[PDB]
């Protein structure tokens, strides 16, 4: 859910691509911007960057297509943030691994009175590197 202002500043950014103000970004305008920044992408690399975002198929990027893509990237950023925050909470002592002791304290806080045997089984299911603890990458895997 983009706010009004978020949209307003994504419109500003879009405007810096849409040089002639017609409401679309062509391959050539994309390449004008990138050469501004000291880059020199080929036509085929430019066309692929257009095609990544062209929901139409019509050759160009209108502001709605651009915003659509920026909202997806916002929602992806915001998911990860929530997952990363969850992990930090679970990792009580903040050493970057959830221990069985830490998982049991958290599980009770969700209203699940777990024994060590059940908690250790959770560890085992999550533990891809075998170290007996849940790292951040193992947590993210379980949350997908």
């Amino acid at each position: 859910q983009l706010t009004e202002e978020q949209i307003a500043e994504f419109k500003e950014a879009f405007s810096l691509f849409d040089k002639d103000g017609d409401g679309t970004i062509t391959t050539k305008e994309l390449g004008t911007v990138m050469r501004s920044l000291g880059q020199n992408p080929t036509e085929a690399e430019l066309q692929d960057m257009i095609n990544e975002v062209d929901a139409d198929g019509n050759g160009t990027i209108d502001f709605p297509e651009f915003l659509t893509m920026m909202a997806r990237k916002m929602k992806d950023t915001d998911s990860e943030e929530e997952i990363r925050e969850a992990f930090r909470v679970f990792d009580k002592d903040g050493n970057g691994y959830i221990s069985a002791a830490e998982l049991r304290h958290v599980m009770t806080n969700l209203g699940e009175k777990l024994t060590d045997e059940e908690v250790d089984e959770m560890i085992r299911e999550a533990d891809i590197d075998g170290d007996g603890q849940v790292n951040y990458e193992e947590f993210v895997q379980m949350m997908t």
Binding site: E82, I83, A86, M107, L110, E112, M122, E125, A126, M143
Partner: peptide, 11 residues
């Protein structure tokens, strides 16, 4: 893990 998933989705 189920419930952890449920809970984090709920936020």
């Amino acid at each position: 893990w189920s419930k952890v998933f449920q809970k984090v989705a709920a936020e």
